[PDB]
């Protein structure tokens, strides 16, 4: 729609060294998969223990049609060898070869994978991660988005089927100013403000989505974006979320 890319996530039992090589999958698919590999840092300001905070980001684009965006198909992997669960992957699009890429990873590497699901607190952390902008000088900056939290409780006779809490852009910023400077405004300022003002504990309620207007929609089992990709920090939070 305004957010045509729907991402699903999978934990992986080992850090895949795709560096070498996509070739085997390429011929399987009789198709040219492009493989990009970069090292990223989260937090980004490279002054952060020149390591540990370094991740490896891999991307596989399935080269194909460009008519309907709902079929745009990309695989993203984030790895960190200094973590116990050292990699996850996620992928968008509805292409039939998606499932064929998964079974290949398994075989080629003998790895097991599992669907990643996000608890409320992680949905919150992902919201904090999504609104970080990285300048050219690799400085991380919070940016402000009108924000909306949706809930779908289970009550007798559908008495209460749905409710939402919306915080306009200016009030998200405003709430952070009372805190004040923070890279985690949803966790540190906004979600607590809601609890203290309403008795509603977001992390305990049936939160089904967090929508950052025009940007991303974070849900229990997926993330939807208007961008054909996910931000470094959002990826880092996903990976941290599956550790023990």
């Amino acid at each position: 729609n305004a957010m045509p890319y729907t991402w699903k996530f999978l934990g992986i039992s080992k850090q895949l060294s795709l560096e070498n090589g996509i070739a085997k999958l390429n011929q399987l698919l009789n198709l040219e998969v492009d493989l990009d590999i970069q090292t990223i840092r989260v937090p980004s300001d490279p002054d952060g223990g020149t390591a540990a905070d370094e991740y490896i980001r891999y991307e596989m684009r399935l080269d194909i049609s460009n008519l309907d965006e709902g079929t745009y198909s990309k695989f993203i992997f984030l790895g960190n060898s200094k973590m116990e669960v050292p990699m996850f992957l996620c992928y968008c699009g509805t292409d039939n070869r998606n499932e064929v890429v998964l079974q290949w990873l398994k075989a080629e590497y003998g790895v097991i994978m599992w669907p990643i699901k996000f608890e409320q607190k992680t949905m919150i952390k992902l919201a904090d991660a999504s609104i970080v902008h990285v300048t050219k000088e690799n400085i991380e900056q919070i940016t402000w988005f009108s924000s909306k939290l949706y809930f779908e409780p289970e009550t007798q006779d559908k008495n209460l089927r749905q409710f939402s809490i919306e915080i306009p852009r200016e009030s998200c910023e405003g709430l952070a100013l009372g805190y004040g400077n923070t890279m985690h405004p949803y966790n540190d300022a906004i979600v607590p403000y809601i609890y203290n003002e309403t008795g509603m504990a977001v992390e305990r309620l049936p939160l089904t989505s967090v929508i950052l207007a025009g940007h991303t929609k974070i849900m229990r089992e997926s993330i939807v974006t208007s961008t054909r990709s996910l931000r470094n920090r959002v990826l880092a939070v996903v990976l941290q979320s599956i550790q023990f």
């Binding site: 006779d157 559908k158 009372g178 003002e197 008795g199 309620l205």
Partner: protein, 77 residues
């Protein structure tokens, strides 16, 4: 039954505005159902909502009417 209301509300909205360090902070709450305040009643019982922190206006004190609450003063519309 157990949570029904004499006059069930199916749609209601509240805008909460508080003045914090001379800045106005706004949040907007919206509810949908067959009987909203009954649903809210159940959630408070199941402890999913903390009833001691539930302001009067959210608990229905005037329920039936959507409105704006400005520094603790409810005004329907």
């Amino acid at each position: 039954s157990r949570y029904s209301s004499l006059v069930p509300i199916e749609k209601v909205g509240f805008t909460l505005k508080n003045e914090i360090n001379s800045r106005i902070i706004t949040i907007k709450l919206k509810f949908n159902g067959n009987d909203i305040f009954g649903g809210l009643h159940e959630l408070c019982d199941k402890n999913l909502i903390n009833i001691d922190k539930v302001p009067g206006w959210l608990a229905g004190e005037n329920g039936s009417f959507s409105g704006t609450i400005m520094n603790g003063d409810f005004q329907r519309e």
